[PDB]
Design a protein around this nucleic acid. Structure first.
Ligand SMILES: [Mg+2]
Ligand SMILES: [Mg+2]
Ligand SMILES: [Mg+2]
Length: 803
RNA sequence: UUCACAUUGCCCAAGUCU
RNA sequence: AAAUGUGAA
């Protein structure tokens, strides 16, 4: 449960394709560098402040310590130098003055880059973490000064263009930068990015922006509260400057002319007229209470400016979002070009600090050979038992019938949309079309709905469903029409999934008024699965050898609360295959600690899923394939430490000695590796993306470990994110080819569409489950209550309610 | 709430002071 | 999931 397995071999399957990766080769010297630990009192100050302190420090003490040695600083307690310092390691305390600080400089170690060169070969067997860290600190020293660091990215005011979002917000552009070891050479991962920022404008113009004013006046009216309430919500927590900066903690109720503070008591507009000799042009407008809520101070809006690129955590409005989308949307070629020209303009080789450490960065994207894996054949049923052949990640169901289609005899229709908008004629025609498409697909809706009744409000949901369950024997499904976005949906799912155990299929009103064969088809894809039907299976003879023995496939995912929240739970979801196809899955879901990635209650979930697998197949899995979504590198060791063991436990407590082999695969969809077609005649579609099946396990992958990029999806828009798969454990000793082919084929078993999805079907179902859980908890966000809300009905346990 | 793909929001990362 | 856009038998 400790070390990830070494890469067994390289993939051989599929035709080759010339690709370019946004990785940039790094020439690293084979010389020692020097680590130094720093201590700065006080330490409660921000990272950038510490950077400033160290900069001033290096400047001042050039003649007795530093001097022509150009150190790098990680913003905390680490400083690296190329050539050594006058250190014994006799610790020297320095006193620094910043427009008042005590600094401790003590030597720690000599980071060997030669050992890193060894490790990159197979000559060392482990990759030195601290060394990679050092190189990273070096690469991001200068841009941490010149730009605004956000995570591993840097953003800045666009050179004379602007991109306003409204509300005092504008688009800032920038780039993610990272240092990664690879099979070949150190790599600088660079990718273009963009995000929202508050314009460094006067607070007055911010008010104009926020309250939709053309300009103040209209008016000199000391606002409403709708103005005061909204403006206060917008500016609170944001920094404002006058030389002196402050954090806005409140907005006064009284105008500057009247707002009073104890000096005897005095008013703001008067105090600024006496001590500061200024006369307010806009006195009627309120004041900003800055600093501590505790105590007082009050600054007029007219003498305050926003600061200096403050990332705007708050959520973007619908219109702002639309603007951002419109601004940052680009095709794969356009993305590629933007990244390239970014790397040209950046000119890393002239950076004095990377120059100090003898580091070279190639200004060209790395050339890498990919392999385009062959898609599996999708076997259908009915009389024909037709075979669909995925072409560029896509196929369809025309003239195909479900492998096992559910015969719908008893069903109901509940419309919560106003009858004026959704008429019985609309329902009738929609029903006719649906019955036709469903008949074609092999899912015969053989009757008219035994029930059809309009209703309104969430309060009407439970009684209506309770009637339906009690009135119609053998009721298979209730189709619910909804008037757009409504709190009724979450309710329907609450009653259906957790309260009554009834199959419900919702459809927006607009998709009833105007039906199309495609929409209806996909809808049937959902309905059939929801009623226990097998849409289609992988061609049994086209599957990898692993299927010769009974094997279970587990999807696993954790979904965390949105940015800003601090009390909502994280949600764990684990699904498990219930046949040899593999097609049917069952779900398990838990609530757990806020922002905990490690699946706390995993063993129980795996036990449930194994039990259900046995009851479904009468087989005990000899192999457990575990697709774990969302775990970053920095968390691998832990997660595998807890989760892998949790699986073993789950087996151990089930039967001794039941020890099926475990393959633990971390799925990463969200990273900064982008692959582009080298040949223009290879780009697919309008977005010009790499074709589905594109597999990369060389050159840019891990120097010693079992990992691979596999873009399994047809890129419709923008630049495809190739899913990265990292194998943390593998008792079954998969070869690269078998595991990659298996993953790719699994990407074709996703029931909700006749396409090849970007991640394996089980992990996707895991996502859907976690999200449905989040739906059951809406407005319900101690432990026992949330857990209760998240627990499905006994008749829903063994279904695919999440489809 | 037909569906996938993209951008954002989600562990690690970052951010936090006078 | 949600906002926003591209798409589809
Ligand atoms: Mg997740
Ligand atoms: Mg953290
Ligand atoms: Mg959408």
């Amino acid at each position: 449960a400790f070390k990830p397995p070494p890469r067994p071999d390289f993939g051989t399957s599929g035709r080759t394709i010339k690709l370019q990766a946004n990785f940039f080769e790094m020439d690293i010297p084979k010389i020692d560098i020097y680590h130094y630990e720093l201590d700065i009192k006080p330490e409660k100050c921000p990272r950038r402040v510490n950077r400033e302190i160290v900069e001033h420090m290096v400047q001042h003490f050039k003649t007795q310590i530093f001097g022509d040695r150009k150190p790098v600083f990680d913003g905390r307690k680490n400083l690296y130098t190329a050539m050594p310092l006058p250190i014994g390691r006799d610790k020297v305390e320095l006193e620094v003055t910043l427009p008042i600080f005590k600094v401790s400089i003590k030597w720690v170690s000599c980071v060997s880059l030669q050992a890193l060169h060894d490790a990159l070969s197979g000559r060392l067997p482990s990759v030195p973490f601290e060394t990679i860290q050092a190189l990273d600190v070096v690469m991001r020293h200068l841009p941490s000064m010149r730009y605004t660091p956000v995570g591993r990215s840097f953003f800045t005011a666009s050179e004379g263009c602007s991109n306003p979002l409204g509300g005092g917000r504008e688009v800032w552009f920038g780039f993610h930068q990272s240092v990664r070891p690879s099979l070949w050479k150190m790599m600088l991962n660079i990718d273009v990015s963009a995000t929202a920022f508050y314009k460094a404008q006067p607070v007055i113009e911010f008010v104009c922006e926020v309250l939709d004013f053309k300009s103040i006046e209209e008016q000199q009216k000391p606002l409403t509260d709708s103005q005061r309430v909204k403006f206060t919500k917008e500016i609170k927590g944001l920094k404002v400057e006058i030389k002196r900066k402050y954090r806005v903690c409140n907005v006064t109720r009284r105008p500057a002319s009247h707002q009073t503070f104890p000096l005897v008591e005095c008013t703001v507009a008067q105090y600024f007229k006496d001590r500061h000799k200024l006369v307010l042009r806009y006195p009627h407008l309120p004041c900003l209470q800055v600093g501590q809520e505790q105590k007082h101070t009050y600054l007029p809006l007219e003498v305050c400016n926003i600061v200096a690129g403050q990332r705007c955590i708050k959520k973007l409005t619908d219109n702002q979002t639309s603007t951002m989308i419109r601004a940052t949307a680009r095709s794969a070629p356009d993305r590629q070009e933007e990244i390239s020209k970014l790397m040209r303009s950046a000119d890393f080789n002239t950076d004095p600090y990377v120059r100090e450490f003898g580091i070279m960065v190639k200004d060209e994207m790395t050339d890498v050979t990919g392999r385009v894996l062959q898609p599996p054949s999708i076997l259908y049923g009915g009389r024909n038992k037709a075979i669909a052949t995925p072409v560029q990640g896509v196929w369809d169901m025309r003239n195909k019938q479900f492998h096992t289609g559910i015969e719908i005899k008893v069903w109901a229709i509940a419309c919560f949309a106003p009858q004026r908008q959704c008429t019985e004629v609309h329902l009738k025609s929609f029903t006719e079309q649906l019955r036709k498409i469903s008949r074609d697909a092999g899912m015969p809706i053989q009757g008219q709905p035994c029930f059809c009744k309009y209703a309104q409000g969430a309060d009407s949901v439970e009684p209506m469903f309770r009637h339906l369950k009690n009135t119609y024997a053998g009721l298979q499904l209730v189709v619910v029409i909804l008037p757009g976005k409504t709190p009724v949906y979450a309710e329907v799912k609450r009653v259906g999934d957790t309260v009554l155990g009834m199959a419900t299929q919702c459809v927006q009103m607009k998709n009833v008024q105007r039906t199309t064969p495609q929409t209806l088809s996909n809808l049937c894809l959902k309905i059939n699965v929801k009623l226990g039907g097998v849409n289609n299976i992988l061609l049994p003879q086209g599957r990898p050898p692993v299927f010769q023995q009974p094997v279970i496939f587990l999807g696993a995912d954790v979904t965390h609360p949105p940015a800003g929240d601090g009390k909502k739970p994280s949600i764990a979801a684990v699904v498990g295959s219930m046949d040899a196809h593999p097609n049917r899955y069952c779900a398990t879901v838990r609530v757990q600690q806020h922002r905990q990635e490690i699946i706390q209650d995993l063993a129980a979930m795996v036990r449930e899923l194994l039990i259900q697998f046995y009851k479904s197949t009468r087989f005990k899995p000899t192999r457990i394939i575990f697709y774990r979504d969302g775990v970053s590198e920095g968390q691998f060791q832990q997660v595998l430490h807890h989760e892998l063991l949790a699986i073993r436990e789950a087996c151990i407590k089930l039967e001794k000695d039941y020890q099926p082999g475990i393959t633990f695969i971390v799925v990463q969809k969200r990273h900064h590796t982008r692959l582009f077609c080298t040949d223009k005649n290879e780009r697919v579609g309008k977005s010009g993306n790499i074709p589905a099946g594109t597999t990369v396990d060389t050159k840019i992958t891990h120097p010693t470990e079992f990992d691979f990029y596999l873009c399994s999806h047809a890129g419709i828009q923008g630049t495809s994110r190739p899913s990265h798969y990292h194998v943390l454990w593998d008792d079954n000793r998969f070869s690269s080819d078998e595991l990659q082919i298996l993953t790719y084929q699994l990407c074709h078993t996703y029931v909700r569409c006749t396409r090849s999805v970007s991640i394996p079907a089980p992990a996707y179902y895991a996502h859907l489950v976690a999200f449905r859980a989040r739906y059951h908890l809406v407005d319900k966000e101690d432990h026992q209550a949330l857990a209760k809300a998240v627990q499905v009905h006994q008749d829903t346990l063994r279904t695919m309610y999440f489809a």
